[PDB]
């Protein structure tokens, strides 16, 4: 697990030759948006508190990879 | 400074030089 | 009968010497050109305690005259030495406490310690806690020197024998009583397995020449001849005399 | 417990300025010796 303070370098990570997967979790209780991406060695997390930079960012990341919002209660 | 690092770095240097020489 | 106790000690099975905690033996340097014609210097790095002995030891570091290296030796420490001191060794070294001189470059009356019986054997004569030897007189022709030993006897040794100036540290170690069986046990448990000593008069006739009886008594005489059979020498061997001494 | 209480009080006074270092030192040694029994006794000595 590794942090990313800003937004610019986060897309730089996602725009890499081995970024295989990504996902998006939203917490209603604490009003938070977490962007998680899975590279070869580490798992990078970006935390946001806003509500509109969330969706607009999602169109900025490359189109080739996929994004699945995590569903509450996930079965084996 | 282990002998390994000294030997490994020299071997790595020699291999790169040999490739350059062949291309020339 | 069986073999008596003082015969079993020669097989070296249980009665050996414990030597795990001893690091090195105490000797001088070997003879060399430098010490034989001039002098060399060393540093006193540490002063340590080795178990099973009085007379603390001193670690001394010298350089090497032939190679790029440094050698370290272990001497017995004389009363007065301190860490960081400068020690000298050779023919032309001044005579202060600590120095190492050939015994011929020494005036009569000085006390020394750790003297070589023959030049090169690296120290044999006086090396216990608080003892010393004294020089008495010289013989420049056919060089030979007479010395007095800590027991009273006198000896003659070659003039190029070595001795290191001073008196061995450790002082009067044997002045306070041990006062406790535990202290005696701890004293001996780092040298040899000999402490608890049984009394031959309490033995059985199969065990010791003094053996049994309906009273505890030696029976025959206790003075044993010098040319006797192995297994008989148990008592006062070759005694010239008995009783309390008076004159000396 | 008692020793800590007395020493804690004394440093407070010296910093505030109610006493100075000479009286402080004298009282500290008077306290190490079994002189004062509790906090009340100490202040009375200071006041006198």
């Amino acid at each position: 697990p590794q942090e990313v303070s800003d937004i610019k370098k986060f897309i730089e990570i996602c725009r890499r030759k081995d970024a295989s997967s990504a996902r998006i979790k939203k917490n209603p209780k604490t009003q938070q948006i977490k962007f998680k991406v899975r590279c070869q060695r580490f798992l990078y997390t970006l935390v946001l508190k806003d509500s509109d930079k969330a969706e607009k960012l999602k169109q900025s990341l490359p189109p080739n990879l996929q994004i699945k919002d995590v569903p509450k209660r996930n079965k084996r | 400074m282990r002998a390994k690092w000294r030997k490994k770095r020299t071997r790595r240097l020699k291999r790169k030089r040999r490739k350059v020489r062949a291309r020339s | 009968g069986r073999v008596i106790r003082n015969q079993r000690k020669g097989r070296g099975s249980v009665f050996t010497a414990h030597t795990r905690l001893r690091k090195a033996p105490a000797k001088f340097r070997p003879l060399d050109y430098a010490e034989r014609h001039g002098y060399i210097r060393g540093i006193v790095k540490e002063i340590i305690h080795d178990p099973g002995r009085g007379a603390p030891l001193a670690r001394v570091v010298f350089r090497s005259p032939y190679k790029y290296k440094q050698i370290t030796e272990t001497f017995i420490a004389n009363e007065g030495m301190y860490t960081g001191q400068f020690i000298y060794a050779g023919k032309n070294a001044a005579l202060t406490v600590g120095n190492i001189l050939p015994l011929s470059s020494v005036p009569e009356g000085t006390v020394v310690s750790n003297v070589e019986e023959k030049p090169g054997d690296r120290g044999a004569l006086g090396r216990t806690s608080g003892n010393y030897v004294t020089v008495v007189g010289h013989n420049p022709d056919e060089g030979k020197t007479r010395i007095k030993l800590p027991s009273g006897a006198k000896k003659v040794v070659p003039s190029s024998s070595r001795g290191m100036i001073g008196i061995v540290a450790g002082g009067g170690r044997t002045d306070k009583p041990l006062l406790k069986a535990s202290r005696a046990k701890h004293k001996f448990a780092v040298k040899r397995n000999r402490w608890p000593k049984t009394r031959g008069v309490a033995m059985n006739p199969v065990d010791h020449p003094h053996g049994g009886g309906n009273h505890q008594h030696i029976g025959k005489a206790s003075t044993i001849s010098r040319y006797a059979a192995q297994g008989q020498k148990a008592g006062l061997i070759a005694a010239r005399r008995t009783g309390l001494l008076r004159g000396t | 417990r008692r020793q800590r209480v007395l020493r804690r009080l004394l440093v407070k006074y010296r910093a505030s300025g109610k006493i100075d270092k000479h009286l402080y030192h004298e009282l500290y040694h008077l306290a190490k010796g079994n002189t004062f029994k509790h906090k009340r006794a100490l202040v009375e000595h200071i006041h006198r």
């Binding site: - | - | 305690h49 009085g54 301190y82 001044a94 450790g170 | -």
Partner: protein
Amino acid sequence: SKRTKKVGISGKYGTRYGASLRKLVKKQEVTQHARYTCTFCGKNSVRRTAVGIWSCKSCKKTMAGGAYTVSTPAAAAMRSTLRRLREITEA
């Protein structure tokens, strides 16, 4: 508040070992646990570590001494005579 009148440091031994031995060990025990003034740095911070080794807590120097005393009368006499002997012999 003296707690004794003659026994002293040898009071740990209770009523054991006999009066004369207790009184005789006091002579060495009292001077072994004492504290002597250093010779190189001047502070009063010298204590015994081993049977013949002494060291200063402040300068970290170490010195070989007596068994139960930083120095012994026999050693001091020898050093003085030897120093006197050498000077006249070389003069």
